Amino acid sequence: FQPTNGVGYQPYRVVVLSFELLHAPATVCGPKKSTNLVKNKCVNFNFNGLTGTGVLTESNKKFLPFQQFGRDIADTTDAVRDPQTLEILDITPCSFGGV
Amino acid sequence: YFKIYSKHTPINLVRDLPQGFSALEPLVDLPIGINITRFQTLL
Amino acid sequence: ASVYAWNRKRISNCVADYSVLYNSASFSTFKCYGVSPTKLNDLCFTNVYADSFVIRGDEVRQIAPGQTGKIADYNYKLPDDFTGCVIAWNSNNLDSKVG
Amino acid sequence: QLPPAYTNSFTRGVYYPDKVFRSSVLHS
Amino acid sequence: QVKLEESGGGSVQAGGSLRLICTAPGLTHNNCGLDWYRRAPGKEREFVSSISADGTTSYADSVKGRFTISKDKVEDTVYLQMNSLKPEDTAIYSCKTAFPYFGNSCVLDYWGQGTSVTVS
Ligand SMILES: *[C@@H]1O[C@H](CO)[C@@H](O[C@@H]2O[C@H](CO)[C@@H](O)[C@H](O)[C@H]2NC(C)=O)[C@H](O)[C@H]1NC(C)=O
Ligand SMILES: *[C@@H]1O[C@H](CO)[C@@H](O[C@@H]2O[C@H](CO)[C@@H](O)[C@H](O)[C@H]2NC(C)=O)[C@H](O)[C@H]1NC(C)=O
Ligand SMILES: *[C@@H]1O[C@H](CO)[C@@H](O)[C@H](O)[C@H]1NC(C)=O
């Protein structure tokens, strides 16, 4: 390929991105962007696919270094560990009642 | 997935398993995806 | 790499900042057949293969599913229903030396 | 060259089945 | 008698791809090559590309490296394959070709209406 060759004959580098999806756990993934943290307000949360609604407050329960969220005698979620700051948040239901 | 749980403990006893209770925290998960039917230790 | 022996690179168990290249806007020919690039940074795949090869300005359009060529006949051919992206930088400047 | 030996695993090999926190409770 | 015509244009992003369609139904017998110029409000027509009867290609200094002027193998439809258009390339493009004289199939010329190209 000449240094001053014409465009119809110039060299051109090329890369092909070929995709593989076998029968196995997936390995190459797209990045997931995170919103910001809000406390003390009835909000709509999603911690690593764990989704729900309620009021997030701070707590004093102490997980074990490998645990992700708590549960209750009725097997309902009530606490969660934030993926980044590594704190323990309590979840309380959004107020409701009769009139 | 291939999952490995483990635990360490100190003992002073010979030639037999101690009678005790202790749980095993998870240690690693590796997403290989290979059929396994046999294994062997190395020492 | 050389056109005769194109170079294949394996990518697995990481995250593809595809936006870091979708935000380049200084490129010669980038077309992904099989998936719209809008969600390219928002997917999960088992494996990625980067095949690097060198073509001519006229040979740039040769390497495609269904389009033939001398290098396409000899160096490599794409499959009938390839699912992947083709990227080509048609720069004579650095791909070829003086003389 | 010896014959195989056996012994008795009294109560061993209990692992946290998953990554959930529970307190003062009896799970099944 | 319109022997050069331009179409297929529109608006493209920066970093996006486009394709241009210029029709020269009498370009083969001329043996005097096809061009691409572009005019801007307040600017004189400056060449975008130039493809001769042999297939050697020249381009506007702002477009070379990405603009690729090419002829169809059959039914010559000289396209201009580009990617990552820049907001400056927006203009009234055109094709220019010389057409037969009494004895010359060349420099006696005719211009094309042009393709309006908008890069936003
Ligand atoms: C996740 O990344 C954030 C961003 O840096 C980390 O937050 C900082 O961690 C450093 C560690 O020394 C502290 O000094 C800063 O005060 C933290 N906050 C900032 C920089 O705003 C966080 O620790 C990381 N967590 C994990 C689990 O990787
Ligand atoms: C590797 O390549 C990338 C992609 O070009 C470089 O990142 C920038 O990409 C833009 C895209 O047009 C160029 O205009 C810039 O000149 C590139 N460089 C910078 C510093 O912005 C990246 O720099 C390259 N790195 C190496 C080590 O080659
Ligand atoms: C694993 O076994 C399953 C069925 O037992 C079979 O379909 C699969 O091909 C096997 N894979 C390997 C890698 O042995």
Query: How far is CA B19 from each of CA A74, B7, D11, D16, E13, rounded to the nearest angstrom?
Result: 34, 15, 7, 20, 72
Pairwise CA distance, residues C77 & C67, whole Å: 9
Return the H-helix or E-strand segment holding B43: none
Asked whether C43 and A30 are in contact (CB, 8 A), the reply is yes
Please give, rounded to a whole number of angstroms, the shortest distance from the CA of A19 to a CA of chain B.
18
Give domain limits for chain E: 5-119
Neighbours of A9 (CB within 10 A): 17
Partnered with residue C53 across adjacent β-strands are A14
Pairwise CA distance, residues C69 & E73, whole Å: 13
Round the CA-based radius of gyration of chain B to a whole number and report it.
Answer: 15
B33 CA from centroid of ligand 3 (Å):
10
Residue A87's Cβ-count burial label (10 Å; 0-12, 13-18, 19+) is exposed
Which structure tokens are listed for E97?
């070709």
Return the H-helix or E-strand segment holding C70: helix C70-74
CB within 8 Å of chain D, chain A residues 25-54: none
Do chains B and E touch, with touching meaning 3 or more CB–CB pairs less than 8 Å apart? no
**DSSP classification of residue E102:** S
Return the H-helix or E-strand segment holding C92: helix C92-95
Which structure tokens are listed for A56?
């997030």
| Interchain pair A20, C45: CB under 8 A | yes
Pairwise CA distance, residues A61 & B21, whole Å: 25
For a mutational test of ligand 1's pocket, the pick from A85, A86, A87, i.e. the residue with the most ligand atoms closer than 8 A to its C-beta, is: A85
Pairwise CA distance, residues A39 & A57, whole Å: 6
CB within 8 Å of chain C, chain E residues 16-55: 17
Pairwise CA distance, residues A94 & A88, whole Å: 19
Q: Would you say how long chain D is, in residues?
A: 28
Domain E5-119: assigned CATH number: 2.60.40.10
Which structure tokens are listed for C69?
């060529």
Partnered with residue A73 across adjacent β-strands are none
Question: Residue A66: left (phi > 0), alpha (psi -120 to 50), or beta?
Answer: alpha
Which structure tokens are listed for C41?
């940074």
DSSP state string for E23-87:
E-TTHHHH-S-EEEEEEETTEEEEEEEEE-TT--EEE-TTTBTTBEEE--SSS---EEEEES--G
DSSP state string for D13-26:
-EE--SSEE--S--
β-strand pairing of C84-89 with C29-33: antiparallel
Asked whether A66 and D21 are in contact (CB, 8 A), the reply is no
CB within 8 Å of chain D, chain B residues 1-43: 5, 16-17, 19-21, 23-26
- Among residues E99, E54, E62, E57, the alpha carbon closest in space to that of E79 is found at E57
Asked whether C66 and C13 are in contact (CB, 8 A), the reply is no
Residues contacting ligand 1 via CB (< 6 Å): A 84, 86
Pairwise CA distance, residues E23 & E41, whole Å: 24
Which of ligand 3's atoms lies nearest the C-alpha of B33? 13
**DSSP classification of residue B33:** -
β-strand pairing of E5-7 with E34-40: unpaired
How many CB pairs below 8 A link B and D?
A: 27
Residue type, E118: T
Please tell me the experimental approach by which this structure was elucidated: cryo-EM
